[PDB]
Amino acid sequence: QFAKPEDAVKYRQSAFTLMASHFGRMTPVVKGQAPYDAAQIKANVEVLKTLSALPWAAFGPGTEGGDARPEIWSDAASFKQKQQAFQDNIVKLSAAADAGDLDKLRAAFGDVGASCKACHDAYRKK
Amino acid sequence: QFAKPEDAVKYRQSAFTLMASHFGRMTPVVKGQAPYDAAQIKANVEVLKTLSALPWAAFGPGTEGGDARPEIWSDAASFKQKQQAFQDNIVKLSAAADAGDLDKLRAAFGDVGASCKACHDAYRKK
Ligand code: HEC
Ligand code: HEC
Ligand SMILES: O=C1O[C@H]([C@@H](O)CO)C(O)=C1O
Ligand SMILES: O=C1O[C@H]([C@@H](O)CO)C(O)=C1O
């Protein structure tokens, strides 16, 4: 769907921007600094769920650029492993949110964040 | 969810960026220049559906900036009318896509795009 590689870069950066907001905004809730409203969180994780599937199609071949490391393309199976694993951690967070269980939510939140960071560590330029 | 107004600006701009991609990428399909796969389009409009609900919460009070005109806030009921109407046109597009009917999809697509443009004309800076 991208006329030029730059358009794929712009897309994925915007998807990540939204993912950061929908993930990060739950930090005060899982810390207890903000109240836990199970329906609120269930709805927010559903948004996060949708957003978190979007970036991957915007790293198609020829779309090198931004802060994406070239290793995303030379090591495609491993990058795919990392995004699928991340999305499996998002499934786990969805299950916690759907269950309305703050303990499971905090554990699953931490797993998701670790997966974000592990991918950056390997595949996002400094 | 925004630490500073700038973060709300960044959010809404990213949401619009994704909406533009998920809307605009259907242009070749509704023109007949690309094949019509009903399941493909149903799925894409579901994404568009989710994205199109996101910007509005990122124009809260104090979040003036970007290419948002100040009229969004001094005329809140009218801006709310415009976003709700836009989202109702998105409902109409979802119904067309769910029905698998390319004629209804093209008509509904055109209504959505007109609603995007009408809001810009009134509320987005040059
Ligand atoms: C690989 C499997 C990743 C996972 C999982 C997550 N992210 Fe990431 N992110 C990745 C890359 C390769 C890039 C650079 C994209 C580019 O072309 O520049 C990014 C970037 C970001 C950004 C910055 C976006 C911007 O405005 O430029 C943010 C804020 C970000 N990523 C956040 C984020 C979060 C919160 C994640 C888990 C919930 C997450 N990412 C996962 C690669 C990968
Ligand atoms: C008001 C009810 C709007 C509707 C409906 C749509 N948009 Fe819009 N858009 C609006 C504003 C006020 C702004 C400026 C936001 C800012 O703070 O700068 C925008 C901006 C955009 C952009 C540019 C985003 C960027 O990267 O800076 C795009 C690409 C865009 N809008 C697209 C778009 C589409 C495709 C819409 C319908 C499917 C649509 N918008 C509706 C206000 C409103
Ligand atoms: O909110 C965020 O979480 C991840 C990472 O910091 C998790 O440790 C990331 O990159 C964000 O923007
Ligand atoms: O794809 C888009 O459609 C609207 C408008 O052009 C519809 O006429 C818009 O602002 C986009 O980026």
Author numbering:
A (entry chain A), B (entry chain A): 1 to 126
Manuscript text:
Unusually, cytochromes c′ are able to utilize both heme faces (distal and proximal) as a means of discriminating NO from other diatomic gases.
All of the tertiary structures are similar to wt AXCP and only salient points concerning the heme region are discussed here.
